[model samples]
Target: VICRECGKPDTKIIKEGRVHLLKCMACGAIRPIRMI
Candidate 1:
């Protein structure tokens, strides 16, 4: 996915069992969004 901060495709996800958080590599911002 494209990062909203830097407007790049450096988005990552941090696993938290049933919950997940979106991570931005470009700006290193933590955007919470459940994936599971």
Candidate 2:
């Protein structure tokens, strides 16, 4: 998935305990993953 903050395609999904995060490799931005 793309980064919501930086609009970068180089993003990864990181799992921390019971939470999930979206990590952007291009901008180094970290955000929580939205659950649908």
Candidate 3:
């Protein structure tokens, strides 16, 4: 996915397992959303 904040491709995966979270590379903002 692309970051809406900085539009950098260097994103990171924050959390996973029961929940999924992704962080933006440029702004370092975390995006939390439920995954099935």
Candidate 4:
């Protein structure tokens, strides 16, 4: 999926520990990983 903030297609979801917070790096932009 493309980053709405940066408007780029370099978004990737990241997982770490038990934070349960998903963050994606869209070419230097931080995007929230949305899951249905």
Candidate 5:
């Protein structure tokens, strides 16, 4: 997936219970992924 902060395609997904985190490898930005 693409990163929202840096617009990079290298994004990693981290699952923590009910919350999902998207971490960018290029800019080191972390954001929460919301589930609908």
Candidate 6:
């Protein structure tokens, strides 16, 4: 996958949040959007 901030195609899932967060590795960003 590609990183939205750095545009690098090496983004990875660092951790699995409580079904409401996603920690990306490429940019070390976090997504707090809940998932199903």
Q: Which one wins on lDDT?
A: 5
- Judge candidate 6 against the unseen true structure and give its global Cα lDDT, from 0 to 1: 0.55
Off by over 4 Å in 1: 1-5
Instruction: Record all residue pairs in model 1 with backbone atoms less than 3 Å apart, i.e. clashing.
Output: none
Which runs in model 3 stand beyond 4 Å of their true positions?
Answer: 1-9
Q: Compute each candidate's TM-score over C-alphas.
A: 0.50, 0.47, 0.52, 0.29, 0.54, 0.37
Clashing pairs in 3: none
Residues 1-36, candidate 4, lDDT per residue (tens digit)? 445556545434556653334444545654444344
Query: Candidate 5 lDDT, tens digit per residue, 12-32?
Result: 787877878877787877777
> What's the lDDT of the predicted structure labeled candidate 2?
0.67
lDDT tens readout by residue for model 6, 1-36: 435466653444543545555566656776666555
lDDT of candidate 6 at residue 35, scale 0 to 100: 50
Point out where model 4 deviates above 4 Å. 20-27, 31-36
Candidate 5 ranges with C-alpha deviation above 4 Å: 1-9
**What's model 5's TM-score?**
0.54
Q: What C-alpha RMSD separates each model from the true structure?
A: 2.9, 4.0, 2.6, 4.5, 3.5, 3.8
What lDDT score goes with residue 33 in model 3?
Answer: 85
Candidate 4 overall lDDT versus native: 0.49
Q: Higher-TM-score candidate among 1 and 6?
A: 1
Please give, for residues 1-36, the per-residue lDDT of candidate 3 as tens digits.
Answer: 365656545756766578888776667677678867
Can you list the residue pairs that collide in candidate 5?
A: none
Give model 4's TM-score versus the native structure: 0.29
